[PDB]
Each structure stands twice: as C-alpha cells, then as structure tokens.
Design a binder for these strands. Structure first.
Length: 1315
RNA sequence: AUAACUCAAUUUGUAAAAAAGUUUUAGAGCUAGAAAUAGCAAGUUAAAAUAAGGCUAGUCCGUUAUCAACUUGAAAAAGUG
DNA sequence: CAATATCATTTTTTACAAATTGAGTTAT
DNA sequence: AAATGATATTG
C-alpha cells in the first residue's frame, strides 16, 4: 500500500511517503502538552535540516598541541629541579619570582624584579644584555665565572625554544673555509674536465653563496661570474646541489632516466650509487667536492657570522639583527626629523598606523610594517634601507615567524658550550651536564605516542617496568620495540578470509612470489604450430621466473618472446594472452636484497625463507635504523659488517591483503599442496587465487568459510565524510519513524539518493613551473586568490599555451577562449580540473563526439608528458587526453558512461542501501533464504533533475527548504515507476542478489515512457504484467498537487553545542563583566582574558531575585545561557549553579532545557527558533505558489518551439513580478517583522521596474534571503545592500508555545510557556 | 556485483615535533608646569598562561561522533500517538 | 530599549594505517 | 572560508 523516497544530503534528509496512484497521504496526529489542540493533520512529506557534521581534525590538532604545552612546562620543571639545591644557596626565591612574573605587584608575594629582586641590578642586566642572545653569547664565549641565575635563564631559553628535529645526528658549523671549499669543487672538476677548465678567478663564492637571497638566486649570480658556463651545465647543477636544491643531472650525462639527487634526503647515498655506476666512479670526487662545500654553507640563511669569532653563531646573528636595528632606527629617526617631520609622531607615536610604533607596540606584522614605509623610504634620500627591506632584513625583531629553519643541534651547541664553560666553577653542572642536554634532546618517538597508564583511549605504548618515565630512564622503562610494532600492527588489517591472521608486508618475498605466479598462471602463448593457445608449465614458469623475474626488476612481453620463447623454445613468433606490454607483478624485494647481500644462491635457498620473511617484516614494521639494527643482530653471522650497514638503510612500507597461512601455509587435504603450490604447478588447469578459493573440488573454501564470525557504531565505521555519515544516520532514524507512522507496515519500496583551494594551487604552479624551467611566474606574477578564476588557473597549469594546438596564449584574452572537456560532458558529468582544458576554441580538439583527435594526440603528446612530469596534469588527465591512440571511445565505453549517469556506483551509497535492506528484510523462508519484503531502489539525482526539466516541476533552492522534500517525493515516484515499467532493470537499481549501440540508445531513452510524443499512449503499462505504470491524464496533476502543497514538514534538528568554550583571542584588561578568567585566580579587570563564550544550551529559570538595598525578592522568568564551560558544573547541581548566579527559590521542576534551534510559535502563526539564550533565528517557511516558482526559473533563464512557448509564458505573465513581491511583503510583515528592511526592499524593486525581465527575476531570488528560515543574513537587491534584521532578545518566546518535534515533525508536544 | 595485482589521485583516522601570535609583569623615561598639557627620550628582550579544568594523578585526559517530548534506563537504547 | 558596526589564533615538519576512485591484468 | 552569534558602539 506504500513506498518511501529519501533525499540524503550533508545538511538535509528530505523524505516522502507515496501510495499506488503516486498520491502522498495526509493523516491526523495526536498533539501532546497543555494545549488547546489535541491533534493536527500532516501531509506525509518533509525534511530534517541540521548543521554539517565535522571531522576529528580540529579536535586532534588541539589535542596534540595540549600535549606539547605540558611536555615543555615539564622540560622547564626538569632543569629547575636540578638547580634547586645550589640555587637555594645563591637566591632563596628566584624560581618563585619567576612563576609569579605574570602577577601584578599588588598580587606578587615577592619583589617585582624577577632576576635579582631589586631595581639597580635588574636595570643593569638589561643595559648590558638588551636581549637574552647577548647573554647566550657572553656565557658561551667568556671564561669568567657567571651568576648561577644568568646561567639557568639561557639554559631555559634554549630548552624552552629548542628548534626543530627535522635533521638527524650531529651538526658542527664550519662557515669559514667556503672560499677554499669552492676552489676545491672548481679544481676536482677542472681535473676531470681536463678540456674546459672553470676559471676560479678570485670569484667571491663565500659572499654570493653565504648571501641572503634564495638558493636559485645565489646559483644565478655565482655562475654569472663564470664565463660561458650555463646553470644547466654540469658545474651549475653541482652548485644547485651544494645550495640544498634538487637538480636533474640527466641531459648533462646523456642518460634516459631522472638522475635527480638531494644531499638532505636519506636516499642520496643510493641515488648517487645508481648515477656513479651509470657515468663512472671517476665522478665520485666531484660529488665529494660538492658534499664538502655543502657542510660549510648548509646553514648560511641562519648563521650569517664567521664561526672563527664565536662558538655561538646563532645568538651573534641575532645580536646583529639587533645592532642593525639600532643603527637603522637612529638614522631613520634623524632622516624623518629632517625631510618628513610633519608625519614623525604618526611613525613613532601612533599604534593603529602600522608605523614602527604599530610594529613594536601595536599588532603590525614585519610585512605590514615593511609594506607601510616602502613609500616613505623612497620619497626621501635612503638607498641602503630599501636594499634591506627587499632582503626582508630592515628593522628585524629577534623572535620572528621564520626562526623555524633553526635545528635544535645549533641551540644544543650553545647550551653545551655554556655548561662546558661553567662546570669548571659549578660541580652540579659537571655531574649533570649530560642530564641537562637530554632535556633539550629527548623527544617521545611518534611510534610511542602518549606515555599513558590506562586512561588514554589514544595511547598504545607498553611498559618494560612500572616507574615514572623521564628523558633519562625512557629506554629502560618504555619497551620501545613492542610499542613500535604496536603503533603499526594496531592499524593494519587482519585477513578477511582467515580473520585470525595478520596481513603480510606488501614487500614480503613470498608475497611477491605469490603475486607474480598468480599473474604468470593465466599467461597464454600460441605459435604457427599448436592448434590452440596453451598455459605455462610448472617447469616453464620456474624457468621464466629463474631467467626473467630474478634478473630483470621488470619483465616485458618483448622480453618474454625474445629472452625466453626465442632462446629456449626456438619460436620466431609467439602470441601472449594473459599479460599486456609488461608484468604488473615484480620480484622487487628479491633484486634489492640481491644487490645488498650480493649472494643470489642464499635468496634462492628455500631454507633461509623464514629469516628473509622476518628481515623484510622488520624492514616494514620499524623506520628507526637503530631498532632495525637491533632486530637484525641474530643475522650477524650470515653477512659482512658492510652488508648489515646497507641492509638497515633498506626500509619498506605497505601491507598486503592476505596472510602467510592463506598463500603458502594452508594445504589441500587430497593434494597436501598450498595455494602457492597450485599457482606454481597445477598441471593442465593453471588455476587462479580467486578460483582455488571457490573450486568445490579443493579443500580451500570450507577451510576458509570456517573462520568467519550496533547501528551508530556501524555507520561511524563506514568510509565517507563524517558530514555524510551524519546524513546516513538520520535517513535511517527517519525511515524507522515512517514505518512506526504507517502502524509498523514496511514500504514495498524505499528509494534512496545522495548528493555529490588557493594555498595548494600556487604550490602546484610554483613547483610545476620550477620542475619545468620556465619564466611565466617571474613574468606575470599571480596570488593565491587570483587562481580561483578557473580559466586563469588552467592557463598557468598549461604554461600559458594552448592544450590542443602548440602556440602561445594572451593572459589578457581568456574571456575569448574555451574551457573544453576531454571526455565530453555528454558522457561524464565530471567538471573538475582533471577533465578540463583551455583552448582558443573547442573545435581544435577534433570531433565533438569523442576524446581529442589522433592528429592532436600526435602533435601534443610530447607536450602533455612534460605537464604530467611537472605534476601540472594527473596520470588520469594524461591517460584520457591520449586515449584516442587506443581507438579512443569504443561504442561500448560510450554506452558504459551513459548508464553510469543514472546507475549509482559510489560505495558510500551502496552501504546505505545494504543497511536499510538488512533492517527492512529480517525474515527467512522454508529454504532458509532471506525474504525481500522491501526493495531498496537507489537513484542518481540526474533522473529527477531531467524529470523536473522535461515536465516543468522547476526547482529554485533559494525560495524555501521544501525542495529537499519534493526531490525525495519525485525520487519515490520515478523510482517506483522505472522498475514497475522495466522489471528487468531490478538487477541494477534494486539492492540484493552493435549491442553497445542499443544499450546506449536504450539507457539514453529509458525515461521516455512518461512522454506522450518524442507517439506513446496516454496510459502506460508493463508489457509483461499488464500492471499500469503511468497515466499522463491524471498522474502529472497529482505530482503538481503534491509539489504545490503548502504544509510540508520542515524540521531543524535541535543540537546542544559542543566544542571550544569561547573565542580564542585573549583580550586586554577592561572593566567588563563579559571578560572570562584565563585561569581561576586571574581577575580579568587586572589581567584580561576571554569573551564570546559558546552557549551549550539555554535554560528557562523561573525564580526570585533580590531588588534594591533592603533585598525585596522580585519574581522573574528568563532564559539563562549555560556556556560549554559552565555545563559540567550546571549539570552536577542545577539548583546550586543558579543560586550562586543570584536566582532564589528556583522552581526546579519548571527548568526547561532549550537546545539551539528550539521552536516557538507566536502570534500570527509566526514562529522563532532559539540561537542562544540571547538571540532567535527566523522560524517560518514561505510556501510560494508553483506558478510563481516556475516563472522565477524561466524568467531568470533568459527545443525552439518549447523555447518560444516559454519566453511567451514569461512576457504574457509579467504581472507575476508585482504579485510575488506581495507574497513576500504579506509574509515579511506577518512573521519576519523587518519593517525598515522591507521598505528598502519595496523601494529597491520600484526603481528597477524599468529593467529587463530576466535581471529583475535573478534578484527577486536574492529577496527570498529576507524570508528564509534560520539566521538573518545580508543580501543585495541590485546594488542596494540590505543588512540583516536580527532578533537580539528572547523574551517574546517566554510567553510563546515551545514546540517539541519528532525527526519527521509528525508527532508534536506543544507547551504554552504561561508559567 | 565481488576477490588479488598494477599505476595515479583522493579521503578518513592517529602519533611525534617546530616558529609565531596573543595576554599580564619586568626592563627608573626625562625636563619644564599647580594642572590638565607640552616638548624630547625609548622601542627589537624575557618570565609565565595558551582552552577554565578533571581524577583515574598518567611527562594522562579535556573542542570529533551521538541528542525533541513523555514513561524506562548508568548508558546505549526501549516503550508511547 | 533597538539599530549598527567589528570580530573571529596562524603556520610548519616528520612518521603510519584504512578506505575510495578509475585506468588496466586475471578470476567467481 | 564563510557566516553567524557576541560584543561594544552608536544614534
């Protein structure tokens, strides 16, 4: 008797219930609470609306950082523990004055001067050490005994801001011998290149290299001093190396493969190896001369001082930045006094102005500050100050956005230095030097994570002993292995088939053997002789594997024929059937081990297997070469010191799909042969892995099917956005109430259907243009936000050049060229950067009816490549582009994509359909097979779109939140209709278990049976059953009646607010009540803090409150906003929370919980939704008539007969313009109550009545954002901006009726807040 | 529609780190002048907090997910038209 | 009161697993 | 990244 249609979005679930004549019922429903009404009638259509679900990511980023704050606090707390004993002797309360450094003098327990607890000393420290850097250096360099306090402060500053750990092992600054180390690179070259010596020539390398310009600038200016040596020359590339670049030595040496190196990458030693054994080991002394100059220059950018004058070249570089800032501020003051004194006070007094004033004492960035005085500096006479502003080096602060470069190794340098200096004087610095370094040095390894003890959901790390963990006991108390293993194993899959067993590493030698055989087992070959194509033999496979697979990393078909079938079966010709072009499967790990263990006969020897199957496990499981080393010691006794050294470096990542048991472990009872056996030799039926697992005449399928074995949990475990699994949950909870509503009778059919920047874009270009060698950036600069222009972005991802016709393009002309689609938008409704292309006109592509022509694919393929290489096109885009050189689009492929246009395949959507089927269908028949009482029909949103288009049931999202419902009812309809007509299409749309040309002609014309002509009968019917499917004479009318129905059940899901407590920004002090204490003890009148708390939810307090001096109790009803922070508290004692807010004799059993979007009905059926105890959003949907909806589509939308008939429905029904404004006004006036806005809106319309009919409709659409449900929002009529009329009080709600709604909003509880 | 391989792209989830930013305090401002107010001098650094907090007290946890009403439940979740 | 403007912590490195999509191979 | 609720300012 009935079916459901769902529309499942990320913000909405629309639903609808339909009967056999496509009618949607209308029932009377009980109405609870203390009201007038004991019932209502409710059309059985509606929506649920809801705020987007959100990802863990914010949550997690905030958590990982919380852990960072607490471990650094804890860094300091270690250092301090150490000084405590001997600091007591010097100063009684140093570490005290420091903690209360934040407190105002009034609240300070100790003297207001941190360091020396008086004025005269403190004032002096500062005069002698303006910065901590000045102290850092003095303590490092001076031999003099230093104040224990001054030592601690510098050790703390180094340990509090220790800089990154992105480099491994030790770093020893050598910035002096660069003018030699260059004259050594130049010489070992000139030696090798006997014929073309480079002229050292007293070129200042040290300056041009130790310079403050980009690596790619320093290369230009350094070969600029080398006569007739290009930077694309060998010496030019080598130099790019020494300046931590990635060059491509490939055309230098005449190779045919990317020989790019990078000294900082871990693979350099094995990339260099691959090159030097392509070009010769006479070129080793030239990558030694370029590693040599690298270690003196690695850190120019950061150190900027000769490491002859100091062992603290950082602090010194900062003292410099500082001194420079003195000299340069002195002069800049004077210069302004002279030439521009009129403005001086602005530059140095006014904070809001981005002057030096706003720099230091405002909020002005270096960049803003620098961007402000650009003009000022060059409208005066100075030259060197611009020099500096350009080098971003003008009035530099010591602490800045860019001290990120600084490795810890260099802080540890000075940290060490100092300790080493002062342990001469302080015995406790001697005996704990090593302790104090490891405070700086220690770091919990990412593969251990939280150091928990039972109360972390997050942690996995396992304890070797039950101590408190510390930087100095970590190794001995934390079992690092088991935790490294855990970090990985906990995430990696079990075998779906043997669910007890863990998946093998992707790079497992057996796995590679499995993978290969399973591909070798269906290879077929034919010769002029044999009457049929054969399978490979046991002995032939082995022979292939021996000679081809275990010597070529990659075996080609042209190697199968020429290197096996030729040389071992004397076949001049052969026809291979299983594999195309080359073998997917490869013995990669074999060849890698082969190189490293230099012993073939070991790998081959099947008794070693177990060991080689653990070696590779360990190479996958761990990534710390220390732990790999440890693991691999039990195999000391097999291979040289040198082989172990280069077996550690070898790492692997990735995990199979299958266990060791499944492959080579399980036996057939009959055969005592394993899957690996069956692949390796199955005589005559060279059977597959799929097969072996399904052939009922082998053991392997019962041996599997043996080991086999909540709603909210099930859905949150799917793979989608959490945004779209929020929808999946509600679409179920909806479908349950819609059953409950139909008195627990199950639909005959449920019809589901689901919906479908600038940073990462300039990184894709910048890099693409570099990894290409092209001037277009430096020649037409852009910015993050310009590239959002689709045509602009394209033009740049095509290096300012036509994608079909090698010739330049004019940046200034895009608006004349074409963004053509590769596979055309009449097959694939893909409109991403992957299927899109700028050309001066689409034509040039070739035929409109297919992929780009063989002409173009010829001419251009050389170009496209270079874009693939520059990552300025994906593999996918490359492959589609060129596809015409494999016949392009096959009549079939075509018919393919046009059935994909209506047949959902997206895995997330199948899981919805499966979930529903499995809840709807639970009953079994005599033969104990599932009975399917409910067909879950799934559609694409196209079917209905075109429906709406063809029969004019037009959709204008903007009007109201109704379409969500309409689509779900159109789904229910078309859905039930399609399968009523074409029962055979069940195979595709329903859940459960030459001809191309027709499949296409069919799937393209499926939705015909609705049309009267294209000639079809008025009444339609299933040719087989004789069942009526449609009736052009009275069904369309029922669609138009439903669509037009004015009461539709729209329902904002009410949500208690979660997340951050308030706005993060920490505001000054002010004498406000709004300011919130950043800590319990920190009165924000004195110390400032937080503002704008989020309201978790509002609460109706009726109570009494004291009024005036004598303390008369005045009664009050009002909403109190309970803040996220307050909630824990409020919940644990609602009475006490309100009492210590002022409230008294609170009526505890009148306290109504009011989440966000709580519904109230007021005076003229006017409704308002709660936003907060403090504000309301619009509560009313405006059911515009469909004759007005229809018009507004077409009007706004500028078949030629149809076209004429509809531009002449527009011109003839122009009166509707004034009529629609009216609907808006009667409404805006009745329920919106934005009088002054509404009279701008009326005034705005009246001035543009002389404007085109298209333009005016396009804008009457912007006017609906007045009348829209939810939060008031700003909008433009034409030019006129209409700012949002907000509802900033919640009083009128207190005397309204609260409406408690079901998901569907069919069952209600109405409460008349008259209390 | 399923399973294994291959290549690319994408998404979800986790851990370990870094540089800033922001907030109070500390860096004697000084000469007029009763005063409000002038002139001039200074500015780059640091201590500490970075969800309030929590008990399970860990170098842990503290922003995701889930949520009308009524009866039932610690809860999840059931029952009610 | 209720109109009206201003406001919102930013970024960066490393390490890892799982799904998913879509172009190919081989199968149930 | 908007947009929407907080907030101080304003008329």
């Amino acid at each position: 008797k009935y079916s459901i249609g769902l529309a499942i979005g990320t913000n909405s679930v629309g639903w609808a219930v339909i009967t056999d004549e496509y009618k949607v019922p209308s029932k009377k429903f009980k109405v609870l609470g203390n009201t007038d009404r004991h019932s209502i009638k409710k059309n059985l259509i509606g929506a649920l609306l809801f705020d987007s679900g959100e990802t863990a990511e914010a949550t997690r980023l905030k958590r990982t950082a919380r852990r960072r704050y607490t471990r650094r606090k804890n860094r300091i707390c270690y250092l301090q523990e150490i000084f405590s004993n001997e600091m007591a002797k010097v100063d009684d309360s140093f570490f005290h004055r420091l903690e209360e450094s934040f407190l105002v003098e009034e609240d300070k327990k100790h003297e207001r001067h941190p360091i020396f607890g008086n004025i005269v000393d403190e004032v002096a420290y500062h005069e002698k050490y303006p910065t901590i850097y000045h102290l850092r250096k003095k303590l490092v360099d001076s031999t003099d005994k230093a104040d224990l306090r001054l030592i601690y402060l510098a050790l703390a500053h180094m340990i509090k801001f220790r800089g990154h750990f992105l480099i491994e092992g030790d770093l020893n600054p050598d910035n002096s011998d660069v003018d030699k180390l260059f004259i050594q690179l130049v010489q070992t070259y000139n030696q090798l290149f006997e014929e073309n010596p480079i002229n050292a020539s007293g070129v200042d390398a040290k300056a041009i290299l130790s310079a403050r310009l980009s690596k790619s600038r320093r290369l230009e200016n350094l070969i600029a001093q080398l006569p007739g040596e290009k930077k694309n020359g060998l010496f030019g590339n080598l130099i790019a190396l020494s300046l931590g670049l990635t060059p491509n030595f490939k055309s230098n040496f005449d190779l045919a493969e990317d020989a790019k190196l990078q000294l900082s990458k871990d693979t350099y030693d094995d990339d260099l190896d691959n090159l030097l054994a392509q070009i010769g080991d006479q070129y080793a002394d030239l990558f030694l001369a370029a590693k040599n100059l690298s270690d003196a220059i690695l850190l120019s950018d950061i150190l900027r001082v000769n490491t002859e004058i100091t062992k603290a070249p950082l602090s010194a570089s900062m003292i410099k930045r500082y001194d420079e800032h003195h000299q340069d501020l002195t002069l800049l003051k004077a210069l302004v006094r002279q030439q521009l004194p009129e403005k001086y006070k602005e530059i140095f007094f006014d904070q809001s102005k981005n002057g030096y004033a706003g720099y230091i004492d405002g909020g002005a960035s270096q960049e803003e500050f620098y961007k402000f005085i650009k003009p000022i500096l060059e409208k005066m006479d100075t030259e060197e100050l611009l020099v500096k502003l350009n080098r971003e080096d003008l009035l530099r602060k010591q602490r800045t956005f860019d001290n990120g470069s600084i490795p810890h190794q260099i802080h540890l340098g000075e940290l060490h230095a100092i300790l080493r200096r002062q342990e001469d004087f302080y015995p406790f610095l001697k005996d704990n030097r090593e302790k104090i370094e490891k405070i700086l040095t220690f770091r919990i390894p990412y593969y251990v994570g939280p150091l928990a003890r039972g109360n972390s959901r997050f942690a996995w790390m396992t304890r070797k002993s039950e101590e408190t963990i510390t930087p100095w006991n970590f190794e001995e108390v934390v079992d690092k292995g088991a935790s490294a293993q855990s970090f990985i194993e906990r995430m990696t899959n079990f075998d779906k088939n043997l669910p007890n067993e863990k998946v093998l590493p992707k790079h497992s030698l057996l796995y590679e053997y499995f993978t290969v055989y399973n591909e070798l087992t269906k290879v077929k070959y034919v010769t002029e002789g044999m009457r049929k194509p054969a399978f490979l033999s046991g002995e032939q496979k082995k022979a292939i594997v021996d000679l081809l697979f275990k010597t070529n990393r990659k075996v080609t078909v042209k190697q199968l024929k020429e290197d096996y079938f030729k040389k071992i079966e004397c076949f001049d010709s052969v026809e291979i059937s299983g594999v195309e072009d080359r073998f997917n499967a490869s013995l990669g790990t074999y060849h890698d081990l082969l190189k490293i263990i230099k012993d073939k006969d070991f790998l081959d020897n099947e008794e070693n297997e177990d060991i080689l199957e653990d070696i590779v496990l360990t190479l996958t499981l761990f990534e710390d070469r220390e732990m790999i080393e440890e693991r691999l010691k039990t195999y000391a006794h097999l291979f040289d010191d040198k082989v172990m050294k280069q077996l550690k470096r070898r790492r692997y990542t990735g995990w199979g799909r299958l266990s060791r048991k499944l492959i080579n472990g399980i036996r057939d009872k009959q055969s005592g042969k394993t899957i690996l056996d069956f692949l390796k030799s199955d005589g005559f039926a060279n059977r597959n892995f799929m097969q072996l697992i399904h052939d009922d005449s082998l053991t392997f399928k019962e041996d599997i099917q043996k080991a086999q074995v909540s709603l909210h949990e099930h859905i949150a475990n799917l793979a989608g956005s959490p945004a779209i699994k929020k929808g999946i949950l509600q679409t179920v909870k909806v479908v349950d109430e819609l059953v409950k509503v139909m008195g627990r009778h199950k639909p005959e059919n449920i019809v589901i259907e689901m919906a479908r920047n600038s940073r990462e874009r300039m990184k894709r270009i910048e890099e693409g243009i570099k990894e290409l060698g092209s001037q277009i950036l430096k020649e037409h600069p852009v910015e993050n936000t310009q590239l959002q222009n689709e045509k602009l972005y394209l033009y740049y991802l095509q290096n300012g050049r036509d994608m079909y016709v090698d010739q330049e393009l004019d940046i200034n002309r895009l608006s004349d060229y074409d963004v053509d689609a590769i596979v055309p938008q009449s097959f694939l409704k893909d409109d991403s950067i992957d299927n899109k292309v700028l050309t001066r006109s689409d034509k040039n592509r070739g035929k409109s009816d297919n992929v780009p022509s063989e002409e173009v694919v010829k001419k251009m393929k050389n170009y496209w490549r270079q874009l693939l290489n520059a990552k300025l096109i994906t593999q996918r885009k490359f492959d589609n582009l060129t596809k015409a050189e494999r016949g392009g689009l096959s009549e079939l492929d075509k018919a393919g994509f046009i059935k994909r246009q209506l047949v959902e395949t997206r895995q997330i959507t199948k899981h919805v359909a499966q979930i529903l089927d499995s809840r709807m269908n639970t009953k079994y028949d005599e033969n104990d097979k599932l009975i399917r009482e409910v067909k879950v029909i799934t559609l694409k949103s196209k079917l209905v779109s075109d429906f709406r288009k063809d029969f004019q049931f037009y959709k204008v999202r903007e009007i109201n939140n109704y379409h969500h419902a309409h689509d779900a009812y159109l789904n229910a309809v078309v859905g039930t209709a399609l399968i009523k007509k074409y029962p055979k299409l069940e195979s595709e749309f329903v859940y459960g278990d030459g001809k191309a040309t027709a499949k296409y002609f069919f799937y393209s014309n499926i939705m015909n049976f609705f049309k009267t002509e294209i000639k079809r009968p008025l009444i339609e019917t299933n040719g087989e059953t004789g069942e009526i499917v449609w009736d052009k004479g009275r069904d369309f009318a029922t669609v138009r009646k439903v669509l037009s129905m004015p009461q539709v059940n729209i329902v904002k899901k009410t949500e208690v607010q979660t997340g951050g407590f308030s706005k993060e920004s920490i505001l000054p002090k002010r004498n406000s009540d709004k300011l919130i204490a950043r800590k319990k003890d920190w009165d924000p009148k004195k110390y400032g803090g937080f503002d704008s708390p989020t309201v978790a939810y509002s609460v109706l307090v009726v109570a009494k409150v004291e009024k005036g001096k004598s303390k008369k109790l005045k009664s009050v009803k009002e909403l109190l906003g309970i803040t996220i922070m307050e909630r824990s508290s409020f919940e644990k004692n609602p009475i006490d929370f309100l009492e210590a807010k002022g409230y008294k004799e609170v009526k505890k059993d009148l306290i109504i919980k009011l989440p966000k979007y709580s519904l109230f009905e007021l005076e003229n059926g006017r409704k308002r939704m709660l936003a907060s105890a403090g504000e309301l959003q619009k509560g009313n949907e405006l059911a515009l008539p469909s004759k007005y909806v229809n018009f507004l589509y077409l009007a706004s939308h500028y078949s030629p007969e149809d076209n004429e008939q509809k531009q002449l429905f527009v011109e003839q029904h122009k009166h509707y313009l004034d009529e629609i404004i009216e609907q808006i006004s009667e409404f805006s006036k009745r329920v919106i109550l934005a009088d002054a806005n509404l009279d701008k809106v009326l005034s705005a319309y009246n001035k543009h009545r002389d404007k085109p009919i298209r333009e005016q409709a396009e804008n009457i659409i912007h006017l609906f954002t007045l009348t829209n449900l939810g939060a008031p929002a700003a909008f433009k009529y034409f030019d006129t901006t209409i700012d949002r009329k907000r509802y900033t009080s919640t009083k009128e709600v207190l005397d309204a009726t609260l409406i408690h709604q079901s998901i569907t909003g069919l069952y209600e509880t109405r409460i008349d807040l008259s209390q």
